[PDB]
Every structure is written in structure tokens, then in C-alpha cells.
RNA sequence: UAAUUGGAAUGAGUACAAUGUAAAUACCUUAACGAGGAACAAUUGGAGGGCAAGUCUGGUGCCAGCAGCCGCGGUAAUUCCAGCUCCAAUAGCGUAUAUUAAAGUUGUUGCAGUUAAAAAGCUCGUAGUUGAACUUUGGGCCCGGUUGGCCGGUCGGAUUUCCAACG
């Protein structure tokens, strides 16, 4: 079935790493998607756009299909992957693989007094990709996701209950808007709130503890 | 920075600068020049009645090659002469000279529509009844 | 299926089978949508509902020799006049919706 | 970060750079976790007992990673007379 | 020159007209509640959007604001009384979580159906407007009555209605009449 | 895919009455009539995309026309004219003009000016806008340090407490 080629892949297959927050805390480069199929199951996907791109040749036009898919289970984890291919079906399959490998954590928070199980984002965060800036604003309870039907659909898979948006630039370029929203939610752990001022003892990497399980034989 | 004044006692400059740059706006100018009253064929109105002078055939612009079956109309309240398109087929038979038609805008707020060159108006009512009714045989044109 | 139980089974529960249908709303029914998978996964040749042996011969006369023409008959059932042409004697794969409109427009009760 | 009843949320708490005190993001692949052996009499580095420093990928790209460890390790007694406060 | 009559409209059309998510989210709200049209659904979300605007206004203000305390309890006890907010959910963070579903539950067109005696959610709608159900002592034929908490023991057939006694109506009365003139004599 | 059947319920209406009212009309009540597809029969716009819903059939053949915009039509039209089917809102729905949101396309919040529209040829200069730094700490109680010692516990550094005031 799955024969791992990466040291991180061997530790996940051996069950020595059981949560994906171990990877995210040590910034480990995920190289194969079967790592995070056995580590984030119940992670649905949805294809957001299929459009053709053409390169013109001496004889005719070389058309092939770009696919934008997003993944995320429903809680804390988002993945966006873009792939072009000769067939629409092949681009979606390959796009899902790229979508998984780019899974990231989102930091969720409270707009106000904290009454358990955060609904909104912790801060105001922005993200830009090619003249499209997407701003994400924390919203009070019961607001829902106030966004475009594609950007809202990415924040549904994120796990955000209530959020506001602004936008700028040519948002009709759907790839640049989704890439700008992916940057905006990935920056939620970028921002250092006063919650995080306290020092930590710098834990030891699982690749460094379980070293002989990771190493090949 | 940023090329505009920012000082707290500088509201006059910002207010007069906003005023001067409002004139670059298309509809702010027409609201404050009264262009609808003086220049537009309807006197700033949604509708106007007219009198049919002749049946016209206007060639559709590229890439369409039809004949558009419009009429030339002179208004009552102004005397101005406008060209108005006669909608879906057979309606040019229902319109004749001197039928006292009713006109409306043609959708685009003072601009031509579709492949018709230089027509900004359409007929709604002819002889005071309708064109929908006459086209659908729901009413009958008065004998005139 | 049709009001036999779908109101009787809804006694203060209000959710059993409330999922959405396939979702065309003008493309025709799925009467062979089950058979479409079987011919896809079976790696040989299968015979597609071979012929119309006597429903061709007997019902062409009862329909069309009465008053009508196939150019007329295909116009009221809304199909091309070659569709009825291959329902005349032979050379068709009979689907349900076309054969149903063939029956209810001209009465002869042979399926 | 916690709720009203003190129950912890925020599924992981991130590492922070030991030079510039900034968050190591989950996609900072230029960030580095330096492990330094602890030693005792007659050498013989003790296995599995470290002195650990984390450096963010911003610092390493700027070229400050060497000067940072010289400060970060001299203050821990790992070095002497290598890093000087007054330039 | 007589003083004006105040009036207002009680619904709002959604911004984007043709969805496949919102247009098919009417599976519940029109087939599973037996409703006339989308205006009965747009009406509920209008009042529900009116609720959150007041609640968001209060939450911004300081805790132990006398304005927050006064209009807070008033907003809770009004929503408690009609039975849309549950018995202990009484907090301004929970009126914002209040959704469209538990408003259509409190309608008399469904409360008739849930309290037996209707055998369908839009058999109940027919019975209400045919002057059959009375609440307390009062016949109501408004399917959007929004019953209170001390009223579910008082949905019952009307003292005038044929199903509450009182000399059955003109169909059976005439139907028994023609058997009287055919079989009786 | 219907298709044949049954008892039940009701008001839209026709109205004795009473009520209402200055007098009436109407409402709210109410005796007597008042539902089986023929009616007591819901429309208005759409079905390429935006934008929900047919690559079904007949006609036409860059003609007629549609089409807010992109576009459709020159002999197999998912777009015209029709039939069927379906979609949207619904006693309401379409069309025209204006206006607001959209519009961060008027920008105080909050635009842009190298090349997309836009830095005066350059400098002086009045009004206008803007302009370096500097001028003393009296109520009490709880909290953190930073100096001052009464205090070393200890092999030059290791804990802090009772007391000033030091903000």
C-alpha cells in the first residue's frame, strides 16, 4: 500500500506521531500526502474552479485544464492546492494531493468574553496575492461568514463560525483571491498576541527522539 | 505625505478640493448642470408621447446583418425628433404614420443598445393601447 | 414511494429520507442508471435489450395505419422522425421514456 | 489562551525564536532547531541531554544566525571571550 | 391633516436572487413546515435579524450598564415567553445563536401538528383557516400565531367547530339529508 | 408514469335578522343556499453565461427577430417564432427614468500620478496649511520592584522578610 520514503513518513506510519500538531509545532516539511491521510482522516475536499489555459503552437492550440481545490476537515486545518493537467479529472486528483500537503493550522479566537469553543479569529489579519488583498475581521456571535461564496466556502472548511471580510483588487481572479485568503488565515499564528508572551522550554523533535525508527534499514 | 493636507485647521482646503474634483464625475455634473432639462430629448422624464413621421430601416452593425424596423417620431411637449426602435416582429405593421405613440428609454440611460446604431428609444404604446397586447392579440388597435 | 407511507412515516419525526435527488430537473429519468454501471464494470460485451419483435410489427399498424404519419407521430411525442423509424420494425435499443410516450399518445397497451 | 473555565484552546502553542522572540510559523522551512551536547568531566558528551536554541528563518536569511549563537551560547557559559557587547 | 398612520414592512428579499444553496435550503422551510411561499420565510429572518441588531448593540456596551441590563432581560423574557429561547439558555450570547428553525416550531401551524390531531403539517394549515382551532376561548385562523409557553394546553378544537361537537357542517348535514329523502321516505 | 374512486371540511359569493352608523355601506356575528376537474380554473417573466431552469420537437435560414452585457440566427438554432417540459417570485410580476448600496470608480476614515489617466520647464513668493526642545511630586489602604542597613544560610555569588521614601 504505502511504503514511506521520508523519515517523517516512517514515524507516522509506525504510529510514533499521532497528532498533526506535532508536525506543525516543529515545522516539519511534509513531502508525501499519505502522511496526512493517516493523520487527519475525515478531511473532505471540494473543487472550486475549473478553467482552461492555452499555449499556442505552430499547428494549433494546446489547451489544458487548471483546477483549484480546497481541503479542510472542519476544525482548524485548511489546505489549498492548484494544479493544471491535460484532463479535468487528472487535474482534480493531482490538485487534491497538492491541497493536502499544504495543510496549515488556523488560530481561532473570541470577539468578546470567552464562553468556550472559539467562533471567530483572534486578530485582524490580511493576505495579498497579486493585487488581491483579503482582510479578515473578527465578528460578534451569530454574524456568520460574511464573504464571497468562494471565500466563505474556504472559511467553512477552516472552522470559522463568524467573521467579516473586506477585499480589494481584481477579486474576479478566483485563484488570487483564494491564495490571498489562504495567506490571511495562515497568518493567524503569525501574530504574537500577549497570550503568547510566556516563555517555553523548546521541546525536542520527534525525528531526534525516535531516531532509529525514522532511519532506514 | 500622501499629497493632501492633514492639519486640524485645514477643513476648508479639503472641502473645496473635494468640490472641484466632483466635477470629474459623470452623473454629478449632469445633476448640477441640468443637462436632463436642457439637452436631453425627453425633458428629464421616463416617458414621452410622440407623433410618427416615417418608418425607418436601420442596418444592424457588425457582426449582425439584419434590418431593425424602427420609426421616426416627433414629440409633443418639445417638438424634437427622435428615432425609436419598434420591438418584436410584426409590430411595424401595427404602427403607421400619425398614430401618437408612447416612448420610453431603451434601457441604457441615454445610450444606444445592441447592434442598432443611434437609437436610444423604444415604442411602448401605439394608439394608446399597448404593443404587448397587439402582439399577443389580447387587444385590438382602434380604427383610425 | 408516492404518498403510500411518506406522510404516514412522518409522524412527528419529520426527517427520514429528506435527501436531494440526482438533480437534472429536465434531463430524463434514471431508469437505466443502474444498468450503466453494470456495462461499465463488466469487462466483456453484453447485449443491450436486443430488439422489438412484435411490439414493432403489430403496434406500428395500430398506431400509424389508423390515421397518422411518423412525421406527425414523432412531432406529438417530441422525437426526431428517425427515432420512430427505428421503432417501426427493428434496429433500436428501447428506452422507457420514449416507449412510454409512444404508448400514451396512441393508446395501444403493448410495452 | 483559554476559555472562561481555564480549559485550554488553540490546538498548538508555537515555538518562538530565541534570537528575535518571534513566532516560528508552521511553514517557516528555513527555521532551525540547534541541539548542543552537554558535557562532563573527561569529555564524554551525555547522550540525549541538550542545550537547545531555535532560530527563525528570518534571522538566518539576514546573516545574523552566527552572531546570534555567539551571544546565545556565551550567556549560557558555552563560550568565553567570543561575543562582545560593545562593538 | 389628521396625524399619519405608522406602518412598516415585515420582510426582506435576499441580496443574491438565484442561489443553489439558499434556494434549496427551502426544503425544510417550505416542505417540512408546509408554507405558502418564500415571504413567510423572509419574514422570520427579518425579525431574527432585528433581534441580533439589538443584541449586538447591547454586547458592545459595558457589563452592568443599566441600559444593557434593562433591555437585556426584556429581550430575553420576550423570547423565553414565546418559547424560542430554551428554559435556561438565557444569555445574550445565545440569542445570537438563535436560528430560523426554532421560530417555525412555535407557529400555530406546526404546534397544532405536533400536538396530535392534525396528521400532517399542512392538514393543520387547512384546519386552522377553516375556523376549527381555538386557543383558550378564542378561535384563531392565523397560521402564524406564534403560541406562548402557557398556551400549549389550550390548543383544542373550537366549541363552534364540527370536530368539537356542535352539529356538523353543511356537507354531512346535506349528505344525511338526501338519504333521509331517499331511505326515510 | 398516473387513474380511476370515496366520504369529510370550509369561505369567495347570494342573503332573514341583529349589530354597526347622524342615516347608511362595509367589517365582526349569523338562520337558509353555496366544490368534483366543466370548474368557484393565477399570473408575470425566463430556460447559453452572469443567473435557477431542456443540447426535446416543428418552422425560419445573417431573413424574421432576440439580446441590459458577452453573444444568437447564412439549411441538424440548448438563444428567434411555436408546442411540450422545467425554473423564479407570487396576488402580484415585468419595463422606463431617477437615486442609494455595490463604489477604496470622489477616497476625512480611504484612491491614484516611472511605464495604464495624471508631478506645473524651473525657481522666488503673499494669503493659506504646517512648524525643534525647555518651566515642581501632599488622604488612606493593598501589589511589584531599588536602592539602606538590623539580619549569611554558605562554600567572589545563593532566599527574602519588619521598617523608611523612591517614584
From Swiss-Prot, chain B:
Compartments, record wording: Cytoplasm
Classification via InterPro entries: NA-bd_OB-fold, Ribosomal_uS12, Ribosomal_uS12_euk/arc
Any one GO molecular-function label of the UniProt entry: structural constituent of ribosome
Keyword Ribonucleoprotein: yes
Highest taxon listed in the record's lineage: Eukaryota
UniProt modified residues of type 3,4-dihydroxyproline: 63
GO BP term, pick one: regulation of translational fidelity
Chain residue numbers at which the record places covalent cross-link Glycyl lysine isopeptide (Lys-Gly) (interchain with G-Cter in ubiquitin): 55
Family according to the record: Belongs to the universal ribosomal protein uS12 family.
NCBIfam families: PRK04211.1, uS12_E_A
Function summary: Component of the ribosome, a large ribonucleoprotein complex responsible for the synthesis of proteins in the cell. The small ribosomal subunit (SSU) binds messenger RNAs (mRNAs) and translates the encoded message by selecting cognate aminoacyl-transfer RNA (tRNA) molecules. The large subunit (LSU) contains the ribosomal catalytic site termed the peptidyl transferase center (PTC), which catalyzes the formation of peptide bonds, thereby polymerizing the amino acids delivered by tRNAs into a polypeptide chain.
Self-association and partners: Component of the small ribosomal subunit (SSU). Mature yeast ribosomes consist of a small (40S) and a large (60S) subunit. The 40S small subunit contains 1 molecule of ribosomal RNA (18S rRNA) and 33 different proteins (encoded by 57 genes). The large 60S subunit contains 3 rRNA molecules (25S, 5.8S and 5S rRNA) and 46 different proteins (encoded by 81 genes).
PANTHER family: 30S RIBOSOMAL PROTEIN S12 FAMILY MEMBER
Additional observations: Present with 10600 molecules/cell in log phase SD medium.
Protein known as: Small ribosomal subunit protein uS12A
Protein species of origin: Saccharomyces cerevisiae (strain ATCC 204508 / S288c)
Classification lineage: Eukaryota, Fungi, Dikarya, Ascomycota, Saccharomycotina
Swiss-Prot record, chain D:
Subcellular location: Cytoplasm
GO cellular component annotations of the record: cytosol; cytosolic small ribosomal subunit
UniProt keyword annotations, A-Z: Acetylation, Cytoplasm, Ribonucleoprotein, Ribosomal protein, rRNA processing
InterPro entries referenced in this protein's UniProt entry, alphabetically: Ribosomal_eS21, Ribosomal_eS21_CS, Ribosomal_eS21_sf
Knockout consequences: Reduction in growth rate, a decrease in free 40S subunits, an increase in the amount of free 60S subunits and a decrease in polysome size.
Domain of life: Eukaryota
Family, as annotated: Belongs to the eukaryotic ribosomal protein eS21 family.
Note: Present with 27400 molecules/cell in log phase SD medium. There are 2 genes for eS21 in yeast.
Record note on quaternary structure: Component of the small ribosomal subunit (SSU). Mature yeast ribosomes consist of a small (40S) and a large (60S) subunit. The 40S small subunit contains 1 molecule of ribosomal RNA (18S rRNA) and 33 different proteins (encoded by 57 genes). The large 60S subunit contains 3 rRNA molecules (25S, 5.8S and 5S rRNA) and 46 different proteins (encoded by 81 genes).
Protein name: Small ribosomal subunit protein eS21A
Provenance organism: Saccharomyces cerevisiae (strain ATCC 204508 / S288c)
UniProtKB/Swiss-Prot annotation, chain E:
Keywords (A to Z) from UniProt: Cytoplasm, Isopeptide bond, Nucleus, Phosphoprotein, Ribonucleoprotein, Ribosomal protein, Ribosome biogenesis, RNA-binding, rRNA processing, rRNA-binding, Ubl conjugation
Domain named S4 RNA-binding: residues: 106-180
Gene3D superfamilies in alphabetical order: RNA-binding S4 domain (3.10.290.10)
Family: Belongs to the universal ribosomal protein uS4 family.
Pfam families tied to this protein: Ribosomal_S4, S4
More about this protein: Present with 106000 molecules/cell in log phase SD medium.
Residues recorded as bearing Phosphoserine in the entry: 183
Gene Ontology MF: a single term: rRNA binding
Keyword rRNA processing attributed: yes
Source organism: Saccharomyces cerevisiae (strain ATCC 204508 / S288c)
Record-linked InterPro entries: Ribosomal_uS4, Ribosomal_uS4_CS, Ribosomal_uS4_euk/arc, Ribosomal_uS4_N, S4_RNA-bd, S4_RNA-bd_sf
Subcellular location: Cytoplasm; Nucleus, Nucleolus
Quaternary structure, from the entry: Component of the small ribosomal subunit (SSU). Mature yeast ribosomes consist of a small (40S) and a large (60S) subunit. The 40S small subunit contains 1 molecule of ribosomal RNA (18S rRNA) and 33 different proteins (encoded by 57 genes). The large 60S subunit contains 3 rRNA molecules (25S, 5.8S and 5S rRNA) and 46 different proteins (encoded by 81 genes). Interacts with snoRNA U3. uS11 interacts with MPP10. Component of the ribosomal small subunit (SSU) processome composed of at least 40 protein subunits and snoRNA U3.
GO biological processes: maturation of SSU-rRNA from tricistronic rRNA transcript (SSU-rRNA, 5.8S rRNA, LSU-rRNA); ribosomal small subunit biogenesis; translation
Region (Disordered): 159-185
PROSITE patterns, A to Z: RIBOSOMAL_S4 (PS00632), S4 (PS50889)
Keyword rRNA-binding applies: yes
The protein, known as: Small ribosomal subunit protein uS4A
Cross-link Glycyl lysine isopeptide (Lys-Gly) (interchain with G-Cter in ubiquitin), sequence positions: 179
UniProt superkingdom: Eukaryota
UniProt GO cellular component terms: 90S preribosome; cytoplasm; cytosol; cytosolic small ribosomal subunit; nucleolus; nucleoplasm; small-subunit processome
Main location: cytoplasm
Amino acid at each position: 500500500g504505502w511504503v514511506p520514503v521520508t523519515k517523517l513518513g516512517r514515524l507516522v506510519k509506525a504510529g510514533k506521531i499521532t497528532t498533526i500538531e506535532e508536525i506543525f509545532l516543529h515545522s516539519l516539511p511534509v513531502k508525501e500526502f499519505q502522511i496526512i491521510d493517516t493523520l487527519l482522516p475525515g478531511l473532505q475536499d471540494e473543487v472550486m474552479n475549473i478553467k482552461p489555459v492555452q499555449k499556442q503552437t505552430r499547428a494549433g492550440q494546446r489547451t489544458r485544464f487548471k483546477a483549484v481545490v480546497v481541503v479542510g476537515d472542519s476544525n482548524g486545518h485548511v489546505g489549498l492546492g492548484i494544479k493544471t493537467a491535460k484532463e479535468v479529472a487528472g487535474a482534480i486528483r493531482a490538485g487534491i494531493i497538492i491541497a493536502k500537503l499544504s495543510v496549515i493550522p488556523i488560530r481561532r479566537g473570541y470577539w468578546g468574553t470567552n464562553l468556550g469553543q472559539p467562533h471567530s479569529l483572534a486578530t485582524k489579519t490580511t493576505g495579498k496575492c497579486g493585487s488581491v488583498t483579503v482582510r479578515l475581521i473578527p465578528a460578534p456571535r451569530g454574524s456568520g461568514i460574511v464573504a464571497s461564496p468562494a471565500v466563505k466556502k474556504l472559511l467553512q472548511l477552516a472552522g470559522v463560525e463568524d467573521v467579516y471580510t473586506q477585499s480589494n483588487g481584481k477579486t474576479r481572479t478566483l485563484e488570487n483571491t483564494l491564495k490571498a485568503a489562504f495567506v490571511a488565515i495562515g497568518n493567524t499564528y503569525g501574530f504574537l498576541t500577549p497570550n503568547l508572551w510566556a516563555e517555553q522550554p523548546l521541546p525536542v523533535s520527534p525525528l531526534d527522539i525516535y531516531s532509529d525508527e525514522a532511519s532506514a534499514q | 505625505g500622501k499629497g493632501k493636507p492633514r492639519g486640524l485647521n485645514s477643513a476648508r482646503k479639503l472641502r473645496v478640493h473635494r468640490r472641484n474634483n466632483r466635477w470629474a464625475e459623470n452623473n454629478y455634473k449632469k445633476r448640477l448642470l441640468g443637462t436632463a432639462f436642457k439637452s436631453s430629448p425627453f425633458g428629464g422624464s421616463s416617458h414621452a408621447k410622440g407623433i410618427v413621421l416615417e418608418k425607418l430601416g436601420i442596418e444592424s452593425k457588425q457582426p449582425n446583418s439584419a434590418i431593425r424596423k424602427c420609426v421616426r417620431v416627433q414629440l409633443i411637449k418639445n417638438g424634437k425628433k427622435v428615432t425609436a426602435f419598434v420591438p418584436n416582429d410584426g409590430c411595424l405593421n401595427f404602427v403607421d404614420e400619425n398614430d401618437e405613440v408612447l416612448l420610453a428609454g431603451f434601457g441604457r440611460k441615454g445610450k444606444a443598445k445592441g447592434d442598432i446604431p443611434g437609437v436610444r428609444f423604444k415604442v411602448v404604446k401605439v394608439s394608446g393601447v399597448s404593443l404587448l397586447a397587439l402582439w399577443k392579440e389580447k387587444k385590438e388597435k382602434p380604427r383610425s | 414511494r408516492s404518498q403510500g407511507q411518506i406522510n404516514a412515516a412522518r409522524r412527528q419525526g419529520l426527517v427520514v429520507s429528506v435527501d436531494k435527488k440526482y438533480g437534472s430537473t429536465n434531463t430524463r429519468g434514471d431508469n437505466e442508471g443502474q444498468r450503466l454501471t453494470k456495462v461499465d464494470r463488466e469487462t466483456d460485451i453484453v447485449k443491450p435489450k436486443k430488439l422489438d419483435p412484435n411490439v414493432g410489427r403489430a403496434i406500428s399498424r395500430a398506431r400509424t395505419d389508423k390515421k397518422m404519419s411518423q412525421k406527425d407521430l414523432a412531432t406529438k411525442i417530441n422525437e426526431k422522425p428517425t427515432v420512430v423509424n427505428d421503432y417501426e420494425a427493428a434496429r433500436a435499443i428501447p428506452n422507457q421514456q420514449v416507449l412510454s410516450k409512444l404508448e400514451r399518445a396512441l393508446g395501444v397497451k403493448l410495452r | 489562551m483559554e476559555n472562561d473555565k481555564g480549559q485550554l484552546v488553540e490546538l498548538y502553542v508555537p515555538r518562538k525564536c530565541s534570537a528575535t522572540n518571534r513566532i516560528i510559523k508552521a511553514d517557516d522551512h528555513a527555521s532551525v532547531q540547534i541541539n548542543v551536547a552537554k558535557v562532563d568531566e573527561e569529555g564524554r558528551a551525555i547522550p540525549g541531554e541538550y542545550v537547545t536554541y531555535a532560530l527563525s528563518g528570518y534571522v538566518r536569511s539576514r546573516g545574523e544566525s552566527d552572531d546570534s549563537l555567539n551571544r546565545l551560547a556565551q550567556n549560557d557559559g558555552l563560550l568565553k571571550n567570543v561575543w562582545s557587547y560593545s562593538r | 391633516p389628521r396625524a399619519p398612520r405608522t406602518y412598516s414592512k415585515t420582510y426582506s428579499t435576499p441580496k443574491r436572487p438565484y442561489e443553489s444553496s439558499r434556494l434549496d435550503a427551502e426544503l425544510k422551510l417550505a416542505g417540512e413546515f408546509g408554507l405558502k411561499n418564500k415571504k413567510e420565510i423572509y419574514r422570520i429572518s427579518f425579525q431574527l435579524s432585528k433581534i441580533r441588531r439589538a443584541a449586538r448593540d447591547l454586547l458592545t456596551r459595558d457589563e452592568k450598564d443599566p441600559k444593557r441590563l434593562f433591555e437585556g432581560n426584556a429581550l430575553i423574557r420576550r423570547l423565553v415567553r414565546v418559547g424560542v429561547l430554551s428554559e435556561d439558555k438565557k444569555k445574550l450570547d445565545y440569542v445570537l445563536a438563535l436560528k430560523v428553525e426554532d421560530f417555525l416550531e412555535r407557529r400555530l401551524q406546526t404546534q397544532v401538528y405536533k400536538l396530535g390531531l392534525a396528521k400532517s403539517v399542512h392538514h393543520a394549515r387547512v384546519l386552522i383557516t377553516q375556523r376549527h382551532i381555538a386557543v383558550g376561548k378564542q378561535i384563531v385562523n392565523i397560521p402564524s400565531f406564534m403560541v406562548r409557553l402557557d398556551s400549549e394546553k389550550h390548543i383544542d378544537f373550537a366549541p363552534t367547530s364540527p370536530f368539537g361537537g356542535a352539529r356538523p357542517g353543511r356537507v354531512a348535514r346535506r349528505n344525511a339529508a338526501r338519504k333521509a329523502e331517499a331511505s326515510g321516505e
